[PDB]
Amino acid sequence: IVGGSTIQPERVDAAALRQLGDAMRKVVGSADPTPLADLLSGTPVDPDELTREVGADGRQALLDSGMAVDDGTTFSSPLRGHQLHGVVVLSDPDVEEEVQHRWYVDPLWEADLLIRLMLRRGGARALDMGCGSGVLSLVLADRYESVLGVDVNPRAVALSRLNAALNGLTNVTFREGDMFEPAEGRFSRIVFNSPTNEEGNEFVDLLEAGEPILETFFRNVPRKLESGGIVEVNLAMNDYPGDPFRERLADWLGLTENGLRVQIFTSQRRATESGGEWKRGWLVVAPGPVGLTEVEWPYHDRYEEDPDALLDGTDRLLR
Ligand SMILES: CN[C@@H]1[C@@H](O)[C@@H](O[C@@H]2[C@@H](O)[C@H](O[C@H]3O[C@H]([C@@H](C)O)[C@@H](O)[C@H](O)[C@H]3N)[C@@H](N)C[C@H]2N)OC[C@]1(C)O
Ligand SMILES: Nc1ncnc2c1ncn2[C@@H]1O[C@H](CSCC[C@H](N)C(=O)O)[C@@H](O)[C@H]1O
């Protein structure tokens, strides 16, 4: 019921989308919403008041692209707008798992925090694996010559293309596919907000794909990573008795064989049935002494107190 709406930026002209985006930049994230911001808040709005704000052609672009639906009397949006780190981003609303369509897109549960964790350097070529709304791709576009976003969710690819268009971004490319299949060549930066959480080894859905999606990602990272390159990964990790996640990750990566350095920053931690541990952390591959290091960095708690404590934290902890 939520996350199956049609998204069609190709049905709308590129300048019109940029103009819509400009209108969203003005009002999205500001309290006391205008009609446009309220539409993008999930509030049914009067289509005439909306027209005052985006014009009649902007009014048509919203309908054609699928950002808005005519309920007859009112307009409503299946999507929700965000403005953060200099981009505007539409995504699905935050709702319970029981009402999520198969193509439900991550509503930015962690994107703002992850962007604050990301190393602030730029470079030549970036890959955003499982790009969802496109949010990480869009931010990376400001400091990378080109960015590729990949997702197996066709709806996420359309949404990603829509968001790029809204921001007038021209150096970002999105491809539908499974993992690294549409990603040719190597990248100096790879970022992955992985679909892993509480499911362990089991595939639940596109947002909880199980540990095997991390095996496949990390096994292939060495032939995809440019020499000197950086990989950043949000993930859940499961330590079982005599079987910690880190030993498996080292194997997948071919740590010594490939000359790789990994640091894991663990933020949340919880005891399990098996006498094991469930962890959520931030994993970084970056040039340095071959090996794996794990530290405790409670960036969730610190995000809640002061979001900008996280800026360059990962740089401080590596340089
Ligand atoms: C791409 N990675 C993400 C990953 O960041 C993580 O996000 C969870 C998220 O699902 C949780 O979100 C959960 O809880 C919210 C709400 C009650 O807060 C629900 O509305 C939502 O349906 C539920 N999945 C949230 N509470 C913590 C994040 N770290 O877990 C899910 C994910 C899709 O794998
Ligand atoms: N085999 C696969 N190949 C590419 N993407 C996949 C995949 N399996 C799951 N995914 C995608 O991984 C994404 C993780 S949700 C993260 C979305 C976005 N990067 C953000 O940070 O908000 C989902 O969009 C899901 O569709």
Side-chain angles (χ1 to χ4, degrees), residues 262-273 275-302:
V262 177
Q263 195 155 318
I264 303 184
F265 308 84
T266 301
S267 175
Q268 302 169 344
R269 178 189 299 259
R270 185 189 70 231
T272 55
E273 348 307 317
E277 244 181 22
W278 173 95
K279 300 170 162 173
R280 169 164 299 289
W282 182 250
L283 175 151
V284 183
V285 180
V290 178
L292 178 144
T293 302
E294 186 168 6
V295 298
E296 312 195 65
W297 184 30
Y299 55 77
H300 286 94
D301 295 338
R302 295 193 178 176

mmCIF file of all heavy atoms in Angstrom, residues 262-302, unseen atoms left out:
data_model
loop_
_atom_site.group_PDB
_atom_site.id
_atom_site.type_symbol
_atom_site.label_atom_id
_atom_site.label_comp_id
_atom_site.label_asym_id
_atom_site.label_seq_id
_atom_site.Cartn_x
_atom_site.Cartn_y
_atom_site.Cartn_z
ATOM 1 N N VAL A 262 40.875 -1.914 7.004
ATOM 2 C CA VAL A 262 39.489 -1.711 7.367
ATOM 3 C C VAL A 262 39.401 -1.207 8.804
ATOM 4 O O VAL A 262 40.133 -1.665 9.687
ATOM 5 C CB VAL A 262 38.680 -3.016 7.200
ATOM 6 C CG1 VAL A 262 37.245 -2.837 7.643
ATOM 7 C CG2 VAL A 262 38.704 -3.433 5.773
ATOM 8 N N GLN A 263 38.523 -0.246 9.039
ATOM 9 C CA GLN A 263 38.182 0.115 10.397
ATOM 10 C C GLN A 263 36.686 0.070 10.544
ATOM 11 O O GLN A 263 35.948 0.597 9.707
ATOM 12 C CB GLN A 263 38.715 1.495 10.787
ATOM 13 C CG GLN A 263 38.675 1.721 12.310
ATOM 14 C CD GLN A 263 39.686 2.746 12.779
ATOM 15 O OE1 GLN A 263 40.826 2.749 12.318
ATOM 16 N NE2 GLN A 263 39.278 3.617 13.709
ATOM 17 N N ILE A 264 36.252 -0.595 11.607
ATOM 18 C CA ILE A 264 34.852 -0.683 11.960
ATOM 19 C C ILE A 264 34.577 0.191 13.176
ATOM 20 O O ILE A 264 35.282 0.106 14.186
ATOM 21 C CB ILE A 264 34.462 -2.143 12.240
ATOM 22 C CG1 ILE A 264 34.788 -2.992 11.013
ATOM 23 C CG2 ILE A 264 32.990 -2.265 12.643
ATOM 24 C CD1 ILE A 264 34.376 -4.418 11.127
ATOM 25 N N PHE A 265 33.561 1.039 13.066
ATOM 26 C CA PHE A 265 33.132 1.879 14.173
ATOM 27 C C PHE A 265 31.771 1.399 14.658
ATOM 28 O O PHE A 265 30.742 1.622 14.004
ATOM 29 C CB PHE A 265 33.068 3.358 13.760
ATOM 30 C CG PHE A 265 34.339 3.870 13.119
ATOM 31 C CD1 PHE A 265 34.572 3.677 11.761
ATOM 32 C CD2 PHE A 265 35.300 4.537 13.882
ATOM 33 C CE1 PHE A 265 35.734 4.148 11.161
ATOM 34 C CE2 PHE A 265 36.464 4.998 13.306
ATOM 35 C CZ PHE A 265 36.687 4.804 11.934
ATOM 36 N N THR A 266 31.765 0.748 15.812
ATOM 37 C CA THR A 266 30.539 0.198 16.365
ATOM 38 C C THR A 266 29.825 1.188 17.288
ATOM 39 O O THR A 266 30.401 1.737 18.234
ATOM 40 C CB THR A 266 30.819 -1.096 17.105
ATOM 41 O OG1 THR A 266 31.403 -2.025 16.184
ATOM 42 C CG2 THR A 266 29.525 -1.685 17.681
ATOM 43 N N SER A 267 28.555 1.409 16.984
ATOM 44 C CA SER A 267 27.746 2.386 17.694
ATOM 45 C C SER A 267 26.709 1.765 18.627
ATOM 46 O O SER A 267 26.597 2.156 19.778
ATOM 47 C CB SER A 267 27.045 3.290 16.691
ATOM 48 O OG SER A 267 26.172 4.167 17.362
ATOM 49 N N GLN A 268 25.939 0.812 18.121
ATOM 50 C CA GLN A 268 24.946 0.131 18.933
ATOM 51 C C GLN A 268 25.347 -1.340 19.069
ATOM 52 O O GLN A 268 26.057 -1.888 18.225
ATOM 53 C CB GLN A 268 23.547 0.288 18.321
ATOM 54 C CG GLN A 268 23.125 1.749 18.153
ATOM 55 C CD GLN A 268 21.857 1.940 17.320
ATOM 56 O OE1 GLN A 268 21.410 1.046 16.605
ATOM 57 N NE2 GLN A 268 21.268 3.123 17.427
ATOM 58 N N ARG A 269 24.905 -1.967 20.146
ATOM 59 C CA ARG A 269 25.372 -3.297 20.502
ATOM 60 C C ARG A 269 24.356 -3.938 21.433
ATOM 61 O O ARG A 269 23.815 -3.272 22.305
ATOM 62 C CB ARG A 269 26.749 -3.205 21.152
ATOM 63 C CG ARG A 269 27.340 -4.514 21.622
ATOM 64 C CD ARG A 269 28.585 -4.218 22.435
ATOM 65 N NE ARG A 269 29.571 -3.520 21.624
ATOM 66 C CZ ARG A 269 30.625 -4.109 21.067
ATOM 67 N NH1 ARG A 269 30.838 -5.407 21.259
ATOM 68 N NH2 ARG A 269 31.477 -3.398 20.331
ATOM 69 N N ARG A 270 24.081 -5.223 21.233
ATOM 70 C CA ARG A 270 23.003 -5.892 21.944
ATOM 71 C C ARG A 270 23.249 -7.401 21.980
ATOM 72 O O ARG A 270 23.694 -7.989 20.991
ATOM 73 C CB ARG A 270 21.661 -5.580 21.277
ATOM 74 C CG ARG A 270 20.443 -6.128 22.003
ATOM 75 C CD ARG A 270 19.155 -5.959 21.161
ATOM 76 N NE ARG A 270 19.137 -6.852 19.992
ATOM 77 C CZ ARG A 270 18.890 -6.466 18.736
ATOM 78 N NH1 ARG A 270 18.623 -5.192 18.453
ATOM 79 N NH2 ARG A 270 18.893 -7.361 17.752
ATOM 80 N N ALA A 271 22.958 -8.014 23.123
ATOM 81 C CA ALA A 271 23.114 -9.451 23.324
ATOM 82 C C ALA A 271 22.012 -10.223 22.616
ATOM 83 O O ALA A 271 20.869 -9.770 22.558
ATOM 84 C CB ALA A 271 23.114 -9.776 24.808
ATOM 85 N N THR A 272 22.353 -11.386 22.071
ATOM 86 C CA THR A 272 21.386 -12.188 21.319
ATOM 87 C C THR A 272 21.092 -13.540 22.002
ATOM 88 O O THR A 272 21.657 -13.833 23.066
ATOM 89 C CB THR A 272 21.880 -12.421 19.869
ATOM 90 O OG1 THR A 272 23.187 -13.002 19.892
ATOM 91 C CG2 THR A 272 21.953 -11.112 19.110
ATOM 92 N N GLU A 273 20.211 -14.345 21.396
ATOM 93 C CA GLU A 273 19.866 -15.677 21.911
ATOM 94 C C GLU A 273 21.101 -16.557 21.996
ATOM 95 O O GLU A 273 21.373 -17.209 23.015
ATOM 96 C CB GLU A 273 18.854 -16.430 21.015
ATOM 97 C CG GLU A 273 18.108 -15.704 19.911
ATOM 98 C CD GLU A 273 17.430 -14.506 20.414
ATOM 99 O OE1 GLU A 273 16.857 -14.661 21.495
ATOM 100 O OE2 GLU A 273 17.343 -13.469 19.707
ATOM 101 N N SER A 274 21.828 -16.579 20.883
ATOM 102 C CA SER A 274 22.910 -17.525 20.663
ATOM 103 C C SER A 274 24.080 -17.308 21.622
ATOM 104 O O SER A 274 25.097 -18.003 21.550
ATOM 105 C CB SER A 274 23.396 -17.428 19.210
ATOM 106 N N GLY A 275 23.926 -16.355 22.533
ATOM 107 C CA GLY A 275 25.040 -15.884 23.327
ATOM 108 C C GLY A 275 25.963 -15.042 22.455
ATOM 109 O O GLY A 275 27.118 -14.785 22.804
ATOM 110 N N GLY A 276 25.457 -14.613 21.302
ATOM 111 C CA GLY A 276 26.225 -13.736 20.445
ATOM 112 C C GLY A 276 25.944 -12.260 20.678
ATOM 113 O O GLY A 276 25.370 -11.874 21.699
ATOM 114 N N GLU A 277 26.351 -11.433 19.717
ATOM 115 C CA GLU A 277 26.054 -10.008 19.740
ATOM 116 C C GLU A 277 25.571 -9.490 18.387
ATOM 117 O O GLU A 277 26.075 -9.894 17.331
ATOM 118 C CB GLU A 277 27.278 -9.213 20.173
ATOM 119 C CG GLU A 277 27.093 -8.475 21.481
ATOM 120 C CD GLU A 277 28.321 -7.676 21.886
ATOM 121 O OE1 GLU A 277 29.144 -7.359 21.003
ATOM 122 O OE2 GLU A 277 28.466 -7.371 23.088
ATOM 123 N N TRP A 278 24.580 -8.608 18.439
ATOM 124 C CA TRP A 278 24.131 -7.839 17.293
ATOM 125 C C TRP A 278 24.744 -6.444 17.400
ATOM 126 O O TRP A 278 24.718 -5.831 18.464
ATOM 127 C CB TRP A 278 22.601 -7.752 17.255
ATOM 128 C CG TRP A 278 22.039 -6.828 16.191
ATOM 129 C CD1 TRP A 278 21.609 -7.181 14.938
ATOM 130 C CD2 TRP A 278 21.845 -5.405 16.292
ATOM 131 N NE1 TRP A 278 21.148 -6.068 14.262
ATOM 132 C CE2 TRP A 278 21.288 -4.968 15.065
ATOM 133 C CE3 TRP A 278 22.080 -4.462 17.298
ATOM 134 C CZ2 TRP A 278 20.970 -3.626 14.820
ATOM 135 C CZ3 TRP A 278 21.763 -3.123 17.052
ATOM 136 C CH2 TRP A 278 21.218 -2.723 15.824
ATOM 137 N N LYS A 279 25.292 -5.943 16.305
ATOM 138 C CA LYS A 279 25.923 -4.636 16.309
ATOM 139 C C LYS A 279 25.426 -3.806 15.144
ATOM 140 O O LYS A 279 25.105 -4.350 14.099
ATOM 141 C CB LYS A 279 27.446 -4.765 16.214
ATOM 142 C CG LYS A 279 28.124 -5.541 17.321
ATOM 143 C CD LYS A 279 29.572 -5.764 16.927
ATOM 144 C CE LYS A 279 30.446 -6.126 18.118
ATOM 145 N NZ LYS A 279 31.810 -6.499 17.647
ATOM 146 N N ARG A 280 25.365 -2.488 15.320
ATOM 147 C CA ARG A 280 25.254 -1.605 14.178
ATOM 148 C C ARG A 280 26.438 -0.666 14.158
ATOM 149 O O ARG A 280 26.740 -0.020 15.153
ATOM 150 C CB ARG A 280 23.964 -0.795 14.187
ATOM 151 C CG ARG A 280 23.989 0.314 13.126
ATOM 152 C CD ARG A 280 22.602 0.881 12.844
ATOM 153 N NE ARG A 280 21.669 -0.119 12.330
ATOM 154 C CZ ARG A 280 21.722 -0.676 11.118
ATOM 155 N NH1 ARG A 280 22.694 -0.364 10.249
ATOM 156 N NH2 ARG A 280 20.795 -1.565 10.767
ATOM 157 N N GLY A 281 27.102 -0.596 13.012
ATOM 158 C CA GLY A 281 28.232 0.286 12.851
ATOM 159 C C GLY A 281 28.471 0.832 11.458
ATOM 160 O O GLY A 281 27.682 0.681 10.513
ATOM 161 N N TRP A 282 29.616 1.481 11.366
ATOM 162 C CA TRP A 282 30.068 2.182 10.197
ATOM 163 C C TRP A 282 31.431 1.600 9.881
ATOM 164 O O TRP A 282 32.323 1.593 10.737
ATOM 165 C CB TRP A 282 30.144 3.681 10.479
ATOM 166 C CG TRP A 282 30.551 4.541 9.332
ATOM 167 C CD1 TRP A 282 31.732 5.211 9.185
ATOM 168 C CD2 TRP A 282 29.756 4.877 8.194
ATOM 169 N NE1 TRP A 282 31.723 5.933 8.022
ATOM 170 C CE2 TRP A 282 30.522 5.747 7.396
ATOM 171 C CE3 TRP A 282 28.468 4.528 7.775
ATOM 172 C CZ2 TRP A 282 30.046 6.273 6.199
ATOM 173 C CZ3 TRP A 282 28.003 5.048 6.585
ATOM 174 C CH2 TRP A 282 28.792 5.913 5.813
ATOM 175 N N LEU A 283 31.569 1.081 8.671
ATOM 176 C CA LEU A 283 32.777 0.416 8.262
ATOM 177 C C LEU A 283 33.462 1.236 7.178
ATOM 178 O O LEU A 283 32.825 1.652 6.211
ATOM 179 C CB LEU A 283 32.449 -0.985 7.753
ATOM 180 C CG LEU A 283 33.567 -1.839 7.153
ATOM 181 C CD1 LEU A 283 33.241 -3.302 7.390
ATOM 182 C CD2 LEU A 283 33.776 -1.581 5.664
ATOM 183 N N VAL A 284 34.763 1.447 7.331
ATOM 184 C CA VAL A 284 35.513 2.214 6.352
ATOM 185 C C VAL A 284 36.734 1.472 5.861
ATOM 186 O O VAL A 284 37.569 1.033 6.664
ATOM 187 C CB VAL A 284 35.965 3.569 6.918
ATOM 188 C CG1 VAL A 284 36.675 4.363 5.846
ATOM 189 C CG2 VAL A 284 34.773 4.326 7.449
ATOM 190 N N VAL A 285 36.818 1.326 4.538
ATOM 191 C CA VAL A 285 38.037 0.885 3.872
ATOM 192 C C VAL A 285 38.755 2.122 3.327
ATOM 193 O O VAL A 285 38.167 2.924 2.593
ATOM 194 C CB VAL A 285 37.763 -0.098 2.719
ATOM 195 C CG1 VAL A 285 39.078 -0.519 2.069
ATOM 196 C CG2 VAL A 285 36.959 -1.314 3.194
ATOM 197 N N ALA A 286 40.024 2.278 3.691
ATOM 198 C CA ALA A 286 40.783 3.457 3.298
ATOM 199 C C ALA A 286 42.271 3.122 3.340
ATOM 200 O O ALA A 286 42.672 2.227 4.084
ATOM 201 C CB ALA A 286 40.456 4.609 4.207
ATOM 202 N N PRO A 287 43.092 3.810 2.532
ATOM 203 C CA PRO A 287 44.521 3.464 2.513
ATOM 204 C C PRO A 287 45.158 3.502 3.890
ATOM 205 O O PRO A 287 44.891 4.422 4.646
ATOM 206 C CB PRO A 287 45.132 4.542 1.609
ATOM 207 C CG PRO A 287 44.007 4.918 0.690
ATOM 208 C CD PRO A 287 42.770 4.865 1.555
ATOM 209 N N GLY A 288 45.977 2.506 4.208
ATOM 210 C CA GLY A 288 46.664 2.469 5.486
ATOM 211 C C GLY A 288 47.232 1.092 5.767
ATOM 212 O O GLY A 288 47.156 0.213 4.919
ATOM 213 N N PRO A 289 47.804 0.898 6.966
ATOM 214 C CA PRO A 289 48.395 -0.394 7.346
ATOM 215 C C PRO A 289 47.429 -1.566 7.169
ATOM 216 O O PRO A 289 46.330 -1.542 7.709
ATOM 217 C CB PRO A 289 48.741 -0.197 8.829
ATOM 218 C CG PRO A 289 48.906 1.300 8.992
ATOM 219 C CD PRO A 289 47.863 1.880 8.064
ATOM 220 N N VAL A 290 47.833 -2.579 6.419
ATOM 221 C CA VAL A 290 46.988 -3.748 6.217
ATOM 222 C C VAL A 290 46.507 -4.323 7.549
ATOM 223 O O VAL A 290 47.315 -4.593 8.444
ATOM 224 C CB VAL A 290 47.724 -4.838 5.424
ATOM 225 C CG1 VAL A 290 46.829 -6.059 5.266
ATOM 226 C CG2 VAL A 290 48.178 -4.280 4.066
ATOM 227 N N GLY A 291 45.192 -4.483 7.693
ATOM 228 C CA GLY A 291 44.641 -5.011 8.933
ATOM 229 C C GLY A 291 43.205 -4.594 9.197
ATOM 230 O O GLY A 291 42.616 -3.856 8.425
ATOM 231 N N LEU A 292 42.632 -5.086 10.288
ATOM 232 C CA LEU A 292 41.288 -4.693 10.681
ATOM 233 C C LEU A 292 41.298 -4.195 12.119
ATOM 234 O O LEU A 292 41.894 -4.819 12.997
ATOM 235 C CB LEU A 292 40.304 -5.848 10.532
ATOM 236 C CG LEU A 292 38.868 -5.538 10.969
ATOM 237 C CD1 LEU A 292 37.906 -6.268 10.058
ATOM 238 C CD2 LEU A 292 38.626 -5.944 12.424
ATOM 239 N N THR A 293 40.645 -3.064 12.344
ATOM 240 C CA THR A 293 40.554 -2.455 13.663
ATOM 241 C C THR A 293 39.087 -2.206 13.979
ATOM 242 O O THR A 293 38.330 -1.823 13.095
ATOM 243 C CB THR A 293 41.348 -1.138 13.716
ATOM 244 O OG1 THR A 293 42.718 -1.403 13.374
ATOM 245 C CG2 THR A 293 41.265 -0.493 15.106
ATOM 246 N N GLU A 294 38.675 -2.461 15.215
ATOM 247 C CA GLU A 294 37.314 -2.141 15.633
ATOM 248 C C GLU A 294 37.382 -1.231 16.833
ATOM 249 O O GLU A 294 38.110 -1.507 17.781
ATOM 250 C CB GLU A 294 36.500 -3.394 15.975
ATOM 251 C CG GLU A 294 35.009 -3.097 16.267
ATOM 252 C CD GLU A 294 34.138 -4.355 16.318
ATOM 253 O OE1 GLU A 294 34.687 -5.483 16.239
ATOM 254 O OE2 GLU A 294 32.899 -4.220 16.441
ATOM 255 N N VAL A 295 36.656 -0.119 16.781
ATOM 256 C CA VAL A 295 36.531 0.727 17.960
ATOM 257 C C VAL A 295 35.065 0.955 18.278
ATOM 258 O O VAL A 295 34.177 0.685 17.449
ATOM 259 C CB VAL A 295 37.255 2.075 17.776
ATOM 260 C CG1 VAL A 295 38.740 1.836 17.574
ATOM 261 C CG2 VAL A 295 36.692 2.821 16.576
ATOM 262 N N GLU A 296 34.807 1.416 19.496
ATOM 263 C CA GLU A 296 33.461 1.812 19.876
ATOM 264 C C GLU A 296 33.317 3.320 19.743
ATOM 265 O O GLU A 296 34.035 4.089 20.376
ATOM 266 C CB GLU A 296 33.142 1.358 21.294
ATOM 267 C CG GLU A 296 33.510 -0.088 21.541
ATOM 268 C CD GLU A 296 32.873 -0.632 22.797
ATOM 269 O OE1 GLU A 296 31.626 -0.724 22.829
ATOM 270 O OE2 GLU A 296 33.616 -0.962 23.752
ATOM 271 N N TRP A 297 32.388 3.724 18.888
ATOM 272 C CA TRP A 297 32.114 5.120 18.634
ATOM 273 C C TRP A 297 30.601 5.244 18.629
ATOM 274 O O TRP A 297 29.944 4.821 17.684
ATOM 275 C CB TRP A 297 32.740 5.565 17.311
ATOM 276 C CG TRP A 297 32.596 7.017 17.003
ATOM 277 C CD1 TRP A 297 32.527 8.046 17.902
ATOM 278 C CD2 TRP A 297 32.496 7.616 15.696
ATOM 279 N NE1 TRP A 297 32.395 9.241 17.237
ATOM 280 C CE2 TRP A 297 32.380 9.009 15.886
ATOM 281 C CE3 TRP A 297 32.503 7.110 14.392
ATOM 282 C CZ2 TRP A 297 32.266 9.903 14.821
ATOM 283 C CZ3 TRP A 297 32.401 8.004 13.334
ATOM 284 C CH2 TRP A 297 32.282 9.383 13.557
ATOM 285 N N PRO A 298 30.033 5.767 19.721
ATOM 286 C CA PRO A 298 28.572 5.804 19.839
ATOM 287 C C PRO A 298 27.980 6.978 19.066
ATOM 288 O O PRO A 298 27.391 7.862 19.678
ATOM 289 C CB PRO A 298 28.352 5.961 21.348
ATOM 290 C CG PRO A 298 29.559 6.750 21.803
ATOM 291 C CD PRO A 298 30.708 6.265 20.935
ATOM 292 N N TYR A 299 28.125 6.985 17.744
ATOM 293 C CA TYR A 299 27.736 8.160 16.966
ATOM 294 C C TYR A 299 26.225 8.365 16.894
ATOM 295 O O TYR A 299 25.778 9.478 16.624
ATOM 296 C CB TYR A 299 28.321 8.091 15.551
ATOM 297 C CG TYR A 299 27.987 6.830 14.772
ATOM 298 C CD1 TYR A 299 26.733 6.649 14.199
ATOM 299 C CD2 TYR A 299 28.936 5.834 14.594
ATOM 300 C CE1 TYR A 299 26.446 5.511 13.468
ATOM 301 C CE2 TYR A 299 28.655 4.697 13.863
ATOM 302 C CZ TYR A 299 27.411 4.543 13.299
ATOM 303 O OH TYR A 299 27.134 3.396 12.587
ATOM 304 N N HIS A 300 25.441 7.308 17.125
ATOM 305 C CA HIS A 300 23.984 7.470 17.242
ATOM 306 C C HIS A 300 23.663 8.389 18.429
ATOM 307 O O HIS A 300 23.008 9.418 18.251
ATOM 308 C CB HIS A 300 23.268 6.117 17.399
ATOM 309 C CG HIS A 300 23.209 5.317 16.127
ATOM 310 N ND1 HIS A 300 24.143 4.360 15.806
ATOM 311 C CD2 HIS A 300 22.339 5.365 15.089
ATOM 312 C CE1 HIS A 300 23.850 3.844 14.622
ATOM 313 N NE2 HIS A 300 22.769 4.439 14.167
ATOM 314 N N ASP A 301 24.151 8.037 19.622
ATOM 315 C CA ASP A 301 23.927 8.871 20.810
ATOM 316 C C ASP A 301 24.430 10.297 20.586
ATOM 317 O O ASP A 301 23.747 11.255 20.903
ATOM 318 C CB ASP A 301 24.606 8.281 22.048
ATOM 319 C CG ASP A 301 24.014 6.947 22.472
ATOM 320 O OD1 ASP A 301 22.853 6.652 22.108
ATOM 321 O OD2 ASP A 301 24.717 6.187 23.176
ATOM 322 N N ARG A 302 25.618 10.437 20.015
ATOM 323 C CA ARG A 302 26.187 11.764 19.798
ATOM 324 C C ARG A 302 25.475 12.549 18.706
ATOM 325 O O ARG A 302 25.420 13.782 18.752
ATOM 326 C CB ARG A 302 27.663 11.651 19.476
ATOM 327 C CG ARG A 302 28.445 11.094 20.632
ATOM 328 C CD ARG A 302 29.909 11.264 20.438
ATOM 329 N NE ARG A 302 30.602 10.754 21.606
ATOM 330 C CZ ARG A 302 31.921 10.692 21.724
ATOM 331 N NH1 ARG A 302 32.697 11.131 20.734
ATOM 332 N NH2 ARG A 302 32.455 10.203 22.841
#
